[PDB]
Design a protein around this ligand. Sequence first.
Ligand SMILES: NC(=O)c1ccc[n+]([C@@H]2O[C@H](COP(=O)([O-])OP(=O)(O)OC[C@H]3O[C@@H](n4cnc5c(N)ncnc54)[C@H](OP(=O)(O)O)[C@@H]3O)[C@@H](O)[C@H]2O)c1
Ligand SMILES: NC(=O)c1ccc[n+]([C@@H]2O[C@H](COP(=O)([O-])OP(=O)(O)OC[C@H]3O[C@@H](n4cnc5c(N)ncnc54)[C@H](OP(=O)(O)O)[C@@H]3O)[C@@H](O)[C@H]2O)c1
Ligand SMILES: NC(=O)c1ccc[n+]([C@@H]2O[C@H](COP(=O)([O-])OP(=O)(O)OC[C@H]3O[C@@H](n4cnc5c(N)ncnc54)[C@H](OP(=O)(O)O)[C@@H]3O)[C@@H](O)[C@H]2O)c1
Ligand SMILES: NC(=O)c1ccc[n+]([C@@H]2O[C@H](COP(=O)([O-])OP(=O)(O)OC[C@H]3O[C@@H](n4cnc5c(N)ncnc54)[C@H](OP(=O)(O)O)[C@@H]3O)[C@@H](O)[C@H]2O)c1
Ligand SMILES: [Mg+2]
Ligand SMILES: [Mg+2]
Lengths: 338, 338, 338, 338
Amino acid sequence: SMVRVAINGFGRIGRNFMRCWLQRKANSKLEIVGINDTSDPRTNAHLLKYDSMLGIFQDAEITADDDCIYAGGHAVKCVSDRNPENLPWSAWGIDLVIEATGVFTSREGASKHLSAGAKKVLITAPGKGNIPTYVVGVNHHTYDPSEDIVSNASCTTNCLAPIVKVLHEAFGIQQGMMTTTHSYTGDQRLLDASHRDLRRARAAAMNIVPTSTGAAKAVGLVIPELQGKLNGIALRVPTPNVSVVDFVAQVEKPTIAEQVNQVIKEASETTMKGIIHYSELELVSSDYRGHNASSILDASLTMVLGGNLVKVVAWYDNEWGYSQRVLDLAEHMAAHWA
Amino acid sequence: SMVRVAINGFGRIGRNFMRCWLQRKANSKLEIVGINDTSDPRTNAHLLKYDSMLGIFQDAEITADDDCIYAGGHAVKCVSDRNPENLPWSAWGIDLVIEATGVFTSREGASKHLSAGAKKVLITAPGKGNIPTYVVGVNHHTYDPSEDIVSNASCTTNCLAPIVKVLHEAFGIQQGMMTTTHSYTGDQRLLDASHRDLRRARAAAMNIVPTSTGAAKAVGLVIPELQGKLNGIALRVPTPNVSVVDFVAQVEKPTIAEQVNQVIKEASETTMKGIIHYSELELVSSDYRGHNASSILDASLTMVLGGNLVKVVAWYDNEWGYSQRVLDLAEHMAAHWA
Amino acid sequence: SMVRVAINGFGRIGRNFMRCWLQRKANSKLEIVGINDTSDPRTNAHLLKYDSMLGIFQDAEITADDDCIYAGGHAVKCVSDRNPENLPWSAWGIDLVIEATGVFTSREGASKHLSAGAKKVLITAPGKGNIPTYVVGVNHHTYDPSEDIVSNASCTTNCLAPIVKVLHEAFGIQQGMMTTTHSYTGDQRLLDASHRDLRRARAAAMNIVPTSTGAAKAVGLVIPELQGKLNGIALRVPTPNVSVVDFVAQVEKPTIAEQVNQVIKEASETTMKGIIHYSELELVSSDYRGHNASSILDASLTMVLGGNLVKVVAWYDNEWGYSQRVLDLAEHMAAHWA
Amino acid sequence: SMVRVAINGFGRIGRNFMRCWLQRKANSKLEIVGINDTSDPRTNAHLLKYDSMLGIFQDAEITADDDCIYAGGHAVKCVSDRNPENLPWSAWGIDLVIEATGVFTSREGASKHLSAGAKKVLITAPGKGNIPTYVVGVNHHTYDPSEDIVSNASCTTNCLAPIVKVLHEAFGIQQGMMTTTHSYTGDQRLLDASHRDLRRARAAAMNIVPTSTGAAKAVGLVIPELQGKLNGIALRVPTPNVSVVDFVAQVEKPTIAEQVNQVIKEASETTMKGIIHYSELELVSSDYRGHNASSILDASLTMVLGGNLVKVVAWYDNEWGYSQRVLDLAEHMAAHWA
Ligand SMILES: NC(=O)c1ccc[n+]([C@@H]2O[C@H](COP(=O)([O-])OP(=O)(O)OC[C@H]3O[C@@H](n4cnc5c(N)ncnc54)[C@H](OP(=O)(O)O)[C@@H]3O)[C@@H](O)[C@H]2O)c1
Ligand SMILES: NC(=O)c1ccc[n+]([C@@H]2O[C@H](COP(=O)([O-])OP(=O)(O)OC[C@H]3O[C@@H](n4cnc5c(N)ncnc54)[C@H](OP(=O)(O)O)[C@@H]3O)[C@@H](O)[C@H]2O)c1
Ligand SMILES: NC(=O)c1ccc[n+]([C@@H]2O[C@H](COP(=O)([O-])OP(=O)(O)OC[C@H]3O[C@@H](n4cnc5c(N)ncnc54)[C@H](OP(=O)(O)O)[C@@H]3O)[C@@H](O)[C@H]2O)c1
Ligand SMILES: NC(=O)c1ccc[n+]([C@@H]2O[C@H](COP(=O)([O-])OP(=O)(O)OC[C@H]3O[C@@H](n4cnc5c(N)ncnc54)[C@H](OP(=O)(O)O)[C@@H]3O)[C@@H](O)[C@H]2O)c1
Ligand SMILES: [Mg+2]
Ligand SMILES: [Mg+2]
């Protein structure tokens, strides 16, 4: 009756997701039963417990042997094969793979998990191609249980799309520009080193690094009305977690900063409760470590010019908040498992 | 015949300005003859030579005694009094004070230098009140030699205003929003500590810190047409120097990214040569250390949506590039010294 | 019954101390009744709650008005006067001042609190001059209840002295060298700026910075046998909290690494329980945030050469661990009050 | 006449080495003719020119096409094969490979270059197994021209061994402990991620990270008298380049700090000229970027206790200084070629 889950890629998102589930395990339809990763259970149990961002895991004991990670008695079988086609998904009765490696985001790549026997794959990133893309709180109720491969979009998409949805329905978004000032991630280089992206090649804790954001295209996938009407970039900066998106929209209905804030506040108390948090506090990025919302609107920073040019600024914990939404999407898939 | 200059406040800008002048001394109408600062000549000579950002000064020898800093034979008299009214400006025949403390930006405050005998004051920051404000390359030819107190605006203003001027004349700027992702400065706190600004209170090398930017108001002072039509914020991040401004404008004439770039490129080769640099390279903040331009347009990041919503992104060395412009303004004042 | 406490200087240590007390308040003989600081209660309440290192305080509500900071319904009266002679210690019935400003470490300075009406002062730093100095777990039982001004030494002294005491009693320390690789503190400069210490003047988050360590002299104060037999330095590095001391000792009784570790482990389970923690885990500085021990021996790093040359390495949370010891010392004084 | 060189692994050391050679190319017996690397010439030309640590290369033009990197009109042929056995060393007439990948440090690994047609290999790291190891200024004159694979040891070995040699000859080193407080390197992880070394797994720019130092064993290889008499560790800290070693020695001849400094100063002016620099200046790590010495003794930090316990502290630019020594060793081999 439980949906048996395997994590492919036990990295920042894979381990954040694991810790999210461990804390919510009592009210879950999911059971994490397997991990595939490039490393071994003892190393991965150590990293699961000792986290530079989340701190030491305290809720339960974490141990390992040659074959398993044990999280408070719960045994998670471990394997290590970079080729998903070889994975023991039928042998372990895996229902859902959390695809968190970053390297199987195409349908062809993610489908290797289906070939190995898994029933469904949830990619923790934008998909490449015609992969259904979901943002919880924006369009996840359109998920169809017949879909075998889905995308939870990116961290920035999950922060920006709920805000855009609210603003679009209140004021009509005609065009919108985004810039996320974003913590560095493991895709960037610690010191200057080769990378397909010549700026992500550059020492990440030393530099402001312009690059792409998945939200530039992904928001238009979860709000189809606005497809082609948004664009923007990322500026990676020397913080290890927590990000903030700056969104400037050309809107149809004239407004003022106060009304924009009130509209988002009301949504955060109703249709978007638990997805958008509304804050009037004068905080900084460290203060949002561990926040469960997809988006925290920083209301003091809202601006409007000429009625139609709206600026909003929203925080997000790109590791933990996004992993909470991966878990929410997986729970939703399990609730609607045909 | 030389304009005798005193530096008040031998900080990041005061010392960057000093090093700018030392490198351009052969073609200068200015002679730096005095320093007032909270510290002593030996400490300040050490900091002038050994700079964590600029490296070790190599062009000439820097030494000191109880009374003077010596920069390649050139003797700079030193004093240490926090109250400008007490300074020896008449006794030293000071013509121009470079006001770089951050604490005398009002007319009443800066005028204390005039009381002490200086003839003119150049504030290295936005002024408080009705202080004439200049950006070299935008409106500095409107300087009037009768003005005894002037402002060189802020680093962000000097980066953004030249770009805005070019865009406004080509496309007509109706409204514009700005966010500078900006290196931390000494006004921020190394660890959490009291500050009039509750976010600048927070550990600067640990945090993304939203705060004010002088450019939100100062661009409208140097381009009067756009007064009240621009607004925006700063996000201070954990880099020690070099900043980048993101500008999203609602424009009257529809355009596309290519045309925006070509317009700025042409200006950078003509009316704005030496003020705006045009770059098609995929660089990061470290690469712009020491750049002399007020603005470096990052052309690969230009975006337009719906013809009328324009996004441009420009780099600036907020210490060195700004200090080059302080020097340019002072040279201009000296050239027009009545 | 309660010893009434005022905090002078509501900085990193003042606020860490406050949070230590708030969490240990049920068994305490201390009542924090007053704060003097350069800032106002609203700013200081904000900083008490929102801490970049400790996270958001959530055990109890924290608020403020013009006169008080409120912590879980406990009203803490606030004043703001840089001269301790002016403080309302008589009117507020202050028994004990926690002197955490960094600028009243001499008897003449700290005694201004006594003139103002306090009965005793606990300096959160090495004293200047003849100030009785204590390290809990090393010599705090020698506390003389007639003393009116005492010192809790420094963070590094509290880490190193317990280990030195154990090693000296087991093996006989003849000489010892120390280097603490130490997080930066607020005494250092965010960007290059004047400082009495020409290296602490230098941008703290981008440099390794050699400087003094208070433990070089203070360990010999709390272990008088070893006066003049130890020396060392600090290397300040770009982490905001948690430090590690490297101690190389020349010992009389020849030993080997296994025996050194066994001796310290046994002490940590008995006479040094709660002061020294013994760890064989392969951890890094982030993992010791919030650790309550004065010293965490990193047993895997113990080395011995030739029988008599002993190297031990010990972690410490220089903000929180030290503040726990400040609280322990204040509680000891309150339990031995005269 | 020229010894034809190929760089294998165009990383931090590969590119620092290239830039060292480009600046010393007029007096060289080496010609860099080829590069093998995991990336392509256009990416690698970009990284060679735009360096976050060294700045923009401006001595000569740097460009690239599908097959070559061009440096000042010098065409450097490029290939990309992770297996050295496949490399075109015979066809390109490669005499000497600079082995800078980090993964061919054993004789079996490095010998794949010889199979491919190179005549000798210089490993830019300690060797694994019986690889002749050299430190310029310590034992490079012992070079045996018949050796086909050699090691230049590590950055810390090159800093520490010259100082150890001078101290041993003057005072007799009986035992010695070392700790290098060391910039992070590309072997560490930007965010917590799997690693054979559970501490190097941890986010490098936000942690103090204890780990191994190659100098613990390698100093005894280049000073055979001291084999087994030294030991130590590294503490990796959040700076991107420049490191400092702390060495505490037990010496036979009793001395004092003044005599230790005099002995090292004299060596730095004579037998160790260009290898050890002697400094009495109060500098920090940023100031030693680009320093050409293997070791900079920070004389102000020298301490002695009891005559026989000696502490010295020495800086080194672990990228650039080490690469200068790689170039020095390669030039020595080219001058003693057989
Ligand atoms: N970090 C964020 O803020 C964030 C937010 C939203 C989404 N995401 C997405 O989540 C994915 C993972 O990102 P991350 O930050 O967690 O990166 P990460 O820390 O590198 O995690 C990826 C993990 O997958 C492992 N791995 C790589 N290739 C594999 C393969 N073929 N088979 C099995 N395991 C493999 C990696 O091992 P190695 O370390 O040995 O390579 C690592 O353990 C990416 O798609 C990323 O874009 C990231
Ligand atoms: N840094 C930038 O990127 C930048 C760019 C453009 C403009 N500015 C503006 O330039 C000004 C200085 O900024 P900064 O970054 O150079 O700061 P800074 O490094 O703190 O420099 C200010 C200097 O003035 C000294 N000082 C303070 N009060 C004084 C007084 N009453 N009399 C004499 N000297 C006094 C300070 O001494 P202490 O260190 O002892 O306080 C310090 O040496 C501010 O207005 C700032 O907003 C800064
Ligand atoms: N941080 C550590 O790891 C550590 C560990 C052990 C001991 N200590 C010692 O503890 C003391 C404080 O260190 P810290 O790191 O907490 O420094 P800090 O963050 O600068 O805190 C000092 C506090 O005192 C305030 N202050 C300064 N002068 C004052 C005056 N005359 N009257 C009232 N308030 C005044 C400061 O205000 P402003 O911010 O306006 O100056 C600040 O709030 C020093 O003796 C330090 O060496 C520090
Ligand atoms: N950095 C220092 O301070 C320092 C000092 C002295 C000695 N060393 C030693 O020098 C070596 C390199 O260190 P580093 O810091 O320069 O490391 P790095 O930046 O990672 O450089 C290594 C280079 O080799 C490439 N590479 C790896 N495997 C390869 C293969 N099979 N064929 C071709 N190219 C390959 C890497 O590509 P990828 O980026 O794609 O992996 C990278 O370009 C190591 O032995 C290191 O211990 C380092
Ligand atoms: Mg199958
Ligand atoms: Mg006068």
